[PDB]
């Protein structure tokens, strides 16, 4: 189909075929974010999004999500990070190291509607130049199934205090999780391809990039970075080898989530952002220019 451009994003085609006799149909949850909003005047934001996580949880410690850290301006969804002088102290845990730290305020967004396979979800985003995680992801309301489109750390600071090296700003984590809630277990793929690096050593922080996933069926994901298929996750052995879904696969409809996180396992090793690093607000702002969603339908 050779038709006139209607949206910002039409300069970029959907990087995969919709299937034999099918075409892609844009879903109304898609947003180009070309309007103005903040927590006091949500207006157009409120038609598709809420400015919190899908449940009343403030996030992985020492993250503390705040509604007023979300806004839309200058053609982007903007998520900021700050830390007041008076911020509360939170107990942070990972493994069984244990540490009291100051909280880190940031933001989280959740879609008003859900998606389910078959579906292509693509964000055009500029990863924050921050030790904070910049995240675009999907999670079922019962917290048992998750598809991660973007999980990335954009800062050059990658050394703990110690004993670890951490994945750096040349990587995007392309993953998914399956969970049992109680007693708690987490599966994700664990192979080198899950931490995506391109051949040129692209530092993703430096510009806007398209990252999307084709959630094709419950045993097939395909990840696309700037229109190129860079990782295929196919079959029971890599989707759910421990049988946490009892054979269903990735089958439950999901909320779309966009946020930043000061993640516990990183924060406990010294990668929480310093008060000095947070003086520069552009560095600790995650930007999403747009997010688009297509499903296959009959031609
Ligand atoms: Na935009």
| Dihedral angle sign, alpha carbons of residues 2, 34, 66, 48 | negative
Distance between Cα 240 and ligand 1 center (Å) = 36
Burial class (CB in 10 A: 0-12, 13-18, 19+), 28: exposed
Distance between Cα 199 and ligand 1 center (Å) = 28
Nearest alpha-carbon partner for 214 in 20, 8, 24: 24
> How far is the C-alpha of 70 from the C-alpha of 56, rounded, in Å?
16
Method: X-ray
> How far is the C-alpha of 213 from the C-alpha of 92, rounded, in Å?
32
> How far is the C-alpha of 109 from the C-alpha of 155, rounded, in Å?
22
Q: Are strands 63-65 and 104-106 parallel, antiparallel or unpaired?
A: parallel
Distance between Cα 133 and ligand 1 center (Å) = 21
Distance between Cα 197 and ligand 1 center (Å) = 26
Distance between Cα 34 and ligand 1 center (Å) = 5
> How far is the C-alpha of 134 from the C-alpha of 124, rounded, in Å?
12
Residue-range domain boundaries for the chain: 1-299
Give the active site residues. 146, 151
Q: What is the DSSP string of 180-245?
A: EETTEEEE---SGGGEE--TT---GGGS-EEEEEEEEETTEEEEEETTEEEEEEESHHHH-TT-TT
Q: What is the number of alpha carbons within 13 Å of residue 35 lying toward its C-beta? A: 13
- Are 120 and 293 spatial neighbours (Cβ–Cβ below 8 Å)? yes
Q: Per 3-state DSSP, what percentage of the chain is helix, strand, and coil (rounded to 5)?
A: 10, 45, 50
Helices and strands in the chain, H and E counts: 2, 20
Q: Which CATH number fits domain 1-299: 2.60.120.200, 3.20.20.80, 1.10.760.10, 2.40.50.140?
A: 2.60.120.200
What phi, psi does 154 have (nearest 5°)? -90, -15
């Amino acid at each position: 189909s050779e038709t006139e451009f209607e949206y910002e994003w039409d300069k970029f085609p959907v990087p995969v075929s919709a299937g034999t006799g099918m075409k892609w149909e844009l879903q109304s949850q898609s947003d180009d974010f070309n309007y103005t909003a903040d927590s006091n005047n949500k207006g157009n934001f409120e038609k598709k999004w809420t400015d919190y996580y899908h449940a009343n949880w403030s996030g992985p410690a020492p993250t503390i999500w705040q509604r007023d850290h979300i806004s839309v301006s200058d053609g982007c969804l903007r998520i900021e990070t700050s830390r007041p002088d008076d911020v509360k102290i939170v107990k942070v845990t990972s493994g069984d190291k244990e540490k009291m730290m100051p909280g880190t305020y940031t933001g989280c967004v959740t879609s008003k509607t859900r998606v389910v396979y078959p579906v292509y979800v693509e964000a055009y985003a500029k990863i924050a130049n921050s030790t904070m995680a910049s995240d675009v992801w999907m999670l079922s309301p019962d917290d048992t199934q998750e598809i991660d489109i973007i999980e990335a750390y954009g800062s050059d600071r990658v050394v703990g205090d110690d004993g670890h090296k951490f994945y750096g700003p040349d990587r995007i984590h392309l993953s998914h999780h399956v969970f049992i809630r109680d007693p708690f277990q987490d599966y994700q793929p664990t192979d080198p391809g899950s931490w995506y690096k391109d051949v040129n050593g692209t530092i993703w922080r430096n510009d806007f990039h398209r990252v999307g996933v084709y959630w094709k069926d419950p045993f097939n994901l395909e990840y696309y970075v700037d229109g190129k298929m860079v990782r295929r996750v196919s079959g029971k052995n890599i989707i759910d080898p421990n049988d946490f879904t009892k054979g269903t696969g990735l089958s439950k409809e999901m909320d779309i989530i966009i946020n930043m996180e000061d993640q516990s396992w990183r924060a406990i090793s010294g990668l929480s952002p310093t008060n000095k690093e947070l003086m520069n607000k552009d560095n600790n702002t995650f930007l999403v220019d747009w997010i688009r969603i297509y499903k296959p339908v009959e031609d």
